[PDB]
Amino acid sequence: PEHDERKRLGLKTVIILSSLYLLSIWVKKFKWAGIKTRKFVFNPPKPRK
């Protein structure tokens, strides 16, 4: 019996949830942006310790 509502609500659930997914992704690369583009360099050091 629930049928027509069930897809109705289903509609809403997905549209919102999809958007969150894509929105969440974006956000993630932002907060990671410093670590992703983070870049090291090596310079061996004079032997005395």
Added chain:
Amino acid sequence: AEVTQLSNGIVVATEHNPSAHTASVGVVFGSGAANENPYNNGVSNLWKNIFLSKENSAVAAKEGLALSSNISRDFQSYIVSSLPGSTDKSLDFLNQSFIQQKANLLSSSNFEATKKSVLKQVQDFEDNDHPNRVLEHLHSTAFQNTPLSLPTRGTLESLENLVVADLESFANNHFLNSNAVVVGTGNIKHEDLVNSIESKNLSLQTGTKPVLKKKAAFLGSEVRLRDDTLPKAWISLAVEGEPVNSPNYFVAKLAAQIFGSYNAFEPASRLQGIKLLDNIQEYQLCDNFNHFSLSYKDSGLWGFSTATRNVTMIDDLIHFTLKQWNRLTISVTDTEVERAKSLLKLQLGQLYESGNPVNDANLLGAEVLIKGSKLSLGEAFKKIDAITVKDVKAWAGKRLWDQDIAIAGTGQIEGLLDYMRIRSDMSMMRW
């Protein structure tokens, strides 16, 4: 009585002191270690160190002269100090060194004994002077790929790649008259120097301007020199500050003044009326800190600098501090501001009113270059005091709150956290 300023081609500036036992003369070139380039770095500190090589400094040692030199970022100075009466003994020895002589100091036995000592010089600094080392790299990353970045004393790299043909390449471009100012400090008159200056003829490369580069800029960034073999941890942090001759030049120096400067050892320091201090002291989060608002012609650096033997708890150290900085925008006590205005003045004094002529030179030379004249203490104070709280709450509101920072450091900084933490503490959660 109000500092003298007159130009006959050579802009001649002086500042009299009737209670000075000595005086000093010299030049200030309005182009410093930030008018250099990536691979000629340290050329300006190389020039300083031939100028004090035993050769030229033994000359002026029979004469009774002492020479002073320093390089900054926007500027560059060459000062000589002696008794006030031997005031021609200064001007002549200056004249010899900068228009007469050229290759007498530029020997292949001189220059390969100076460069083989400005190399040991910049190899004790980056080796054992971490607080400035950290402080220097802070510029390198905040002002990356831009004028201010180049360390004043120059990279050991671009400092073994430089011959005399390079000392000159910078000299003949940026050692001009239209980029210099002659200074008279201590115990001499304006009519003693500008007389003894128009006494001498000649003109070096007249009409010539020194050249320009892409104006400096700022970008939120880090650079970390971890070294777990060094007993402490040194960190310096900041935002895009305020330039010399910026509307908030003083507003910003007042802010620095509030949180100020700590030394966990001097019991005097432990009692300062600084709010932040309430936190830091509980567990002894650090050994010392200090703030600043470094101002340069094109851009500035408001932040602070700390050393600490406390490695597990650095993460709070940076936290308590950057949170305090938030108050400056949202909740600074007026009665804090007064203690600032008050203390700024005392500091700004011992800066400007020290009984040492050499300082009053660079101060004068740099300022009378950038804005033309100097600004009097009464002028400064008249500004400092005008400053309301709203002064400080709108300056932090643009400059401090939620803006990119610029961290750098070395020693045991594994505990020093990451960039999305630190940077995030620039704000506080609101409804």
